[PDB]
Each structure stands twice: as C-alpha cells, then as structure tokens.
Amino acid sequence: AIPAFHPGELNVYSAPGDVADVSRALRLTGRRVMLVPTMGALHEGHLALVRAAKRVPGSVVVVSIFVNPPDDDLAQLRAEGVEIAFTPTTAAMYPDGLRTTVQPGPLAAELEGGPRPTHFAGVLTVVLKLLQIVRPDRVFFGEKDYQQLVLIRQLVADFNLDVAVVGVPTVREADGLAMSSRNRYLDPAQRAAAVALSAALTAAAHAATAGAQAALDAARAVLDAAPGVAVDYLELRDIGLGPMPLNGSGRLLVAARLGTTRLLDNIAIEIG
Amino acid sequence: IPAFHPGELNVYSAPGDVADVSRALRLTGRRVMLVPTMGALHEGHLALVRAAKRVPGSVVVVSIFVNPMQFLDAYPRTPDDDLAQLRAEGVEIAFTPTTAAMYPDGLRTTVQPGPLAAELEGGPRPTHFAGVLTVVLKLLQIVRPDRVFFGEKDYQQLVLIRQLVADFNLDVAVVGVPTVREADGLAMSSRNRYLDPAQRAAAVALSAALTAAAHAATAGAQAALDAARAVLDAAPGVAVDYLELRDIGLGPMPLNGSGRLLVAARLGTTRLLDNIAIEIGTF
Ligand SMILES: COc1ccc(S(=O)(=O)NC(=O)c2cc3cc(OC)ccc3n2CC(=O)O)cc1
Ligand SMILES: COc1ccc(S(=O)(=O)NC(=O)c2cc3cc(OC)ccc3n2CC(=O)O)cc1
Ligand SMILES: COc1ccc(S(=O)(=O)NC(=O)c2cc3cc(OC)ccc3n2CC(=O)O)cc1
Numbered sequence: 001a002i003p004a005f006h007p008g009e010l011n012v013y014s015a016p017g018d019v020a021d022v023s024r025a026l027r028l029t030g031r032r033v034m035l036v037p038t039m040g041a042l043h044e045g046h047l048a049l050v051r052a053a054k055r056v057p058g059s060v061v062v063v064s065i066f067v068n069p070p071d072d073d074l075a076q077l078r079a080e081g082v083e084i085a086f087t088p089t090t091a092a093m094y095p096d097g098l099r100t101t102v103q104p105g106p107l108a109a110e111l112e113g114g115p116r117p118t119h120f121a122g123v124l125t126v127v128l129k130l131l132q133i134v135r136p137d138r139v140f141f142g143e144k145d146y147q148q149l150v151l152i153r154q155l156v157a158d159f160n161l162d163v164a165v166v167g168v169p170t171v172r173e174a175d176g177l178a179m180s181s182r183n184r185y186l187d188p189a190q191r192a193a194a195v196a197l198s199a200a201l202t203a204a205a206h207a208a209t210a211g212a213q214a215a216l217d218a219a220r221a222v223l224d225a226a227p228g229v230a231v232d233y234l235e236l237r238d239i240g241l242g243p244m245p246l247n248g249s250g251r252l253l254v255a256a257r258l259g260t261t262r263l264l265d266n267i268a269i270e271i272g
Numbered sequence: 273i274p275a276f277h278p279g280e281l282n283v284y285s286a287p288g289d290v291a292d293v294s295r296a297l298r299l300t301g302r303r304v305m306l307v308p309t310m311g312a313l314h315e316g317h318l319a320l321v322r323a324a325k326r327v328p329g330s331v332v333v334v335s336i337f338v339n340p341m342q343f344l345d346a347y348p349r350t351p352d353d354d355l356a357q358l359r360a361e362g363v364e365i366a367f368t369p370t371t372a373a374m375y376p377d378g379l380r381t382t383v384q385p386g387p388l389a390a391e392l393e394g395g396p397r398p399t400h401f402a403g404v405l406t407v408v409l410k411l412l413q414i415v416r417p418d419r420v421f422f423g424e425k426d427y428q429q430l431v432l433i434r435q436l437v438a439d440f441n442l443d444v445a446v447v448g449v450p451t452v453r454e455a456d457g458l459a460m461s462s463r464n465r466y467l468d469p470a471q472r473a474a475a476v477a478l479s480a481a482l483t484a485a486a487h488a489a490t491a492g493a494q495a496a497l498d499a500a501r502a503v504l505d506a507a508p509g510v511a512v513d514y515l516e517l518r519d520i521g522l523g524p525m526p527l528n529g530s531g532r533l534l535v536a537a538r539l540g541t542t543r544l545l546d547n548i549a550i551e552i553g554t555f
Pocket of ligand 2: 037038039040044045046048049123127141142143144168169170171178179180181182
C-alpha cells in the first residue's frame with residue numbers, strides 16, 4: 001500500500017520509505033519529480049528554488065528539510081503550492097550511524113575546504129542519500145554556494161546518477177548582498193560593509209573587458225575600501241573551478257570574515 | 273534507445289546504452305537482474321546467473337569490467353570464454369564498459385567504506401574496498417537493477433556492499449549466492465588456476481578446516497577454531513594469513529550463537545580465501 005498523497009495539498013512525510021513510495025507512485029502517474037533540499041528556516045532564496053521547480057510542466061515539488069549533523073516553513077511551502085515536504089529525523093537518515101560515506105574529489109580540499117575539510121564529505125553524503133530516497137528528475141540548488149554546487153555536479157557525474165542538477169541564480173537583497181541565513185546577525189556597520197563582497201564581484205565582472213588582472217584588481221580595490229572585512233580568498237577560476245583559462249568563461253569567488261560571520265559570494269565572469 | 277533483441281545476447285559498451293535499454297525494459301515490467309563480474313567466468317558465475325534467471329520475467333544483465341581501482345596486469349581475462357557461456361545460459365545483456373567510459377575524469381568522487389574496510393582483507397590493502405564500492409555503486413546506478421547478485425565467497429566484500437546499499441538508500445535487493453565448490457570442496461576461484469598440482473592437492477585444506485570447525489562447534493568456539501587450525505597445520509605448504517570467527521555482519525559486535533568463520537591462506541604465491549556459516553553450541 002502506497003502511503004496517502006492528496007494532490008494540490010501540502011503532504012508531509014517523515015519516513016524515508018514513505019516519501020520514496022509516494023515519489024515512485026507519482027513518477028508512474030506521469031508527474032516529473034523535482035527536489036529542493038533545504039536545512040529549513042526558509043527564505044526568499046528557497047522560494048526562488050521552489051518557483052524554478054514549480055515551472056516545469058507536470059512537476060510535483062518535493063522540499064526536503066533536514067539539518068545535516070517549522071510550523072512556519074510548512075506554511076511558506078503551502079503558500080507556494082508545494083505538494084510534498086520531506087522532514088526526516090537524524091535517526092531515520094542514519095539508522096546505522098555514520099558508516100559508508102562519500103569522499104569528494106580534490107576540489108573539496110581547496111577554498112572552503114581549507115577552514116572546513118570534511119564539510120563537503122558530509123554534504124555530498126546527505127545529498128546522495130536524498131537523491132536515492134526521492135529519485136527526482138531534477139534537483140535545485142542556489143548558486144551562492146558555488147563550490148558545493150560544482151562538487152554536487154561531480155558527485156552526479158562520478159557516480160552516474162540520473163538526475164539533472166539545476167543551479168538557480170542567487171537571490172540578493174536590494175543592495176546586492178547575497179541572501180544568507182547569516183545576514184540577520186550583522187550589526188548595521190557590518191551589514192553596510194558586507195555589501196563590498198557583491199560590489200567587488202560586479203565591479204570585477206564589468207572590469208573583465210579589460211582582462212583578468214583588471215577584473216581582480218577592481219574586486220580587490222572594492223574589498224580594500226571596506227572596514228572590518230577580512231578576506232579569506234578572492235579567486236578567479238574556470239566554471240568547473242579548475243585554473244582560469246587565458247580567455248573565456250569563469251567564476252570569481254570571494255569569502256570573508258566580518259567579526260564572527262563568514263560570508264561568501266561568487267559571480268560569472270567573461271574574460272575580455 | 274539502442275537495438276535490444278529479446279532472447280538474444282545483446283552486448284553494450286556504452287553506459288548510456290545499457291542504462292536506456294534497462295530503463296526501457298523495466299517500464300515494460302521486466303525485472304532487471306545484475307550479475308557484476310570481473311570476467312574470467314567459471315561455474316560460480318553461472319550459478320549467480322541461474323539464480324538471477326529464476327526471478328520471474330527477469331531480464332539478466334551481466335557486467336564484465338576489470339576495475340583498475342580495487343588493485344592488475346596479472347588478472348585473468350578471457351572474454352571469448354566469458355561471452356560464450358552467457359549465450360549458453362540465455363543471458364540477454366552483457367555490459368562491457370571501457371576504463372575510459374567508467375573513469376573519464378580519473379578517480380575523483382569515491383565511496384569511503386566504513387571501518388570494516390580496514391579489517392581482514394583490507395588491513396594491508398587500505399584503498400582496496402573503496403575501489404570496489406565505487407565501481408559497484410556506479411554499476412548499480414548505470415543499470416538500476418531490482419536485484420544484484422554476489423557469491424558468498426568474498427564474504428567481507430558482500431557485507432560491505434550490503435552496507436553501501438543500506439547507507440546510501442539504494443533501491444536494490446542484494447542476493448548472496450552460496451559458494452560453488454569443486455568436488456573435493458575447494459571454493460571456485462579465478463586464482464585456483466595458479467595452483468601447481470602439489471598446491472591444488474594441499475588447497476583442499478581450507479575447506480576441510482572450515483567444515484571441520486563447523487562440526488567441532490557443538491563443543492564451542494575454541495574447539496571449532498582449534499580443529500580448523502589443526503587441519504591447516506597438517507597441510508603441506510599452507511601458510512595461514514588469518515583464521516577468524518565473527519558475527520555474520522562481521523562488525524562491532526562479539527559473536528552470538530551464529531556467525532562466520534573466515535580463512536585466508538597462501539600456497540606459494542597464491543592467496544586463497546574461504547568462509548563458512550558456523551553455529552556455536554546450540555545450533
Ligand atoms: C486516471 O484517473 C485519474 C488520474 C489522475 C487523477 S488526479 O486528480 O490527477 N490524482 C492523481 O493522479 C493522483 C492520486 C495519487 C495518489 C497517490 O498516492 C495515494 C500517488 C499519486 C497520485 N496521483 C498522481 C498525481 O497526483 O498526479 C484522478 C483520476
Ligand atoms: C546540501 O545542499 C544544501 C542545500 C540547501 C541548504 S540551505 O542551508 O537550507 N539553503 C541555503 O543554503 C540557501 C539556498 C539559497 C538560495 C538562494 O537563491 C536561489 C540564495 C541563497 C541560498 N542559501 C544561502 C543560505 O541560506 O545561507 C544547504 C545545503
Ligand atoms: C566488485 O564485485 C565483484 C563481483 C564479482 C567479481 S568476480 O571476480 O568476477 N567473481 C568472483 O569473485 C566470484 C564469484 C563467485 C561465485 C561463486 O559461487 C556462487 C563462488 C566464487 C565466486 N567468485 C570467486 C572468485 O572467482 O574468486 C569481482 C568483484
């Protein structure tokens with residue numbers, strides 16, 4: 001017996017086996033299964049992922065909410081017309097504790113894997129599990145965590161997963177600051193200074209007609225004009241995060257500490 | 273999707289091809305059975321295949337791939353002898369990928385097995401099981417079978433694959449098939465061919481030791497282990513690596529009434545393994 005599912009209602013499952021059965025029942029009735037993974041505390045960036053997923057003709061949207069080791073979140077999803085919320089416990093996800101895991105490739109040891117070297121192993125492990133539980137046709141992630149998104153594409157590619165990975169443009173505040181759950185903690189002076197990250201990147205992207213060095217010098221100047229912004233890295237790479245080619249498409253990534261808050265941002269760059 | 277000829281042996285090299293045929297088949301309601309092999313097929317593989325064949329409306333996929341990542345040049349390869357037997361058994365799909373198609377980016381994302389992988393066969397081979405679980409995951413994702421078949425001979429490997437499948441929520445049933453033996457009890461293996469006639473005669477000691485322990489066990493674990501050791505010790509040119517009695521999941525738990533006795537031994541340059549279910553005291 002397939003667990004109950006009521007079309008056009010918010011259906012909330014906590015059992016991995018339950019969401020798996022429903023997703024399979026749906027896939028067999030025609031629906032295209034779309035997965036939006038979240039650690040909850042939903043914001044406009046999640047709603048953008050949901051609207052992207054909702055656009056696909058015949059979609060049923062699954063939003064997972066799992067804090068990788070509420071009433072409001074569900075209300076937000078209902079207001080978006082999401083049909084499934086997957087909300088498992090730690091024990092349901094890890095009934096045998098930590099055992100088999102994903103070892104990311106070398107990219108995980110670079111950039112954000114510098115301060116957090118086992119972060120991405122955790123992330124790719126739980127993403128792989130959610131993909132196997134729900135078996136979506138498409139999985140939606142924001143572009144803010146760029147290195148993570150690239151490592152997920154590598155996961156998908158390396159383990160031959162049959163899922164399209166869709167990166168959705170980062171939703172930003174009125175002044176460009178990338179949506180983040182860390183932003184609410186900035187005092188007004190930190191919050192005014194944080195704008196330098198996206199200002200630096202958008203300056204870089206426009207300076208890039210003048211080449212790579214001008215793009216980087218432009219970003220760096222903008223960061224140098226902000227007080228209390230401790231830059232951990234500022235790096236131009238190819239879109240896959242390998243070495244930036246002579247000319248061509250790239251990505252510019254920055255990370256910085258503002259008091260106790262670590263902020264990240266990144267942007268598409270085109271050289272010359 | 274490529275040509276599939278039913279009732280015929282269809283050979284596919286490209287992952288995308290076998291993936292599409294397999295998907296096509298499952299939507300027609302055929303159940304997809306996978307027998308992963310490293311080629312050089314013997315009667316143990318045929319038994320894996322026959323088990324897969326008896327699943328109703330099954331279509332059977334046998335994959336043949338020598339994975340560089342679990343090691344290599346020495347390994348037995350005989351694809352002429354491999355595909356002939358598959359046709360003879362009525363297997364309809366052989367999946368024979370190239371190293372390039374499987375590892376176009378080299379080794380990058382890999383499976384890190386649990387701590388079982390550092391024990392027994394993994395002790396002196398630290399990344400061996402990481403290589404095995406990665407290839408098995410990739411084959412499962414390419415073929416997406418309903419059930420996958422393994423022999424019980426490489427028991428530690430089978431337990432690790434069960435872990436892989438539970439730990440990554442894979443939608444596949446793992447089937448262990450009792451180890452096929454030569455008529456003296458020697459466990460089928462690709463490595464047997466490397467035994468000279470002296471060594472082949474001596475090699476009966478591993479299975480003799482195991483069956484001895486299994487009946488010795490009414491008198492307890494020490495008696496079972498001591499009987500096995502004596503049989504191994506009485507055997508010419510058998511150098512024992514390990515001889516270990518564990519719980520059936522091999523894992524972070526003692527032993528109850530029931531478990532698994534595992535032996536690895538060297539005959540000249542050839543390493544032989546075997547194992548058996550053991551019941552201690554009552555059972
Ligand atoms: C063939 O007759 C039909 C087909 C579809 C519908 S419906 O209004 O679009 N509802 C469903 O299709 C539907 C119900 C349903 C229940 C399930 O678990 C109990 C799982 C999937 C279900 N579906 C498919 C869907 O919502 O698209 C109603 C009647
Ligand atoms: C393993 O993959 C995930 C997926 C989602 C999360 S999360 O912590 O719930 N969500 C976010 O991190 C998040 C999503 C998002 C989307 C955006 O635009 C579409 C912009 C920013 C986003 N964030 C940033 C944040 O919340 O810190 C975390 C890890
Ligand atoms: C990664 O998972 C696998 C799966 C199969 C192989 S293999 O080298 O082609 N085959 C075996 O190792 C094997 C299968 C088998 C079956 C048996 O009876 C059912 C008995 C022994 C078996 N072997 C042992 C062997 O060939 O050494 C190798 C690795």
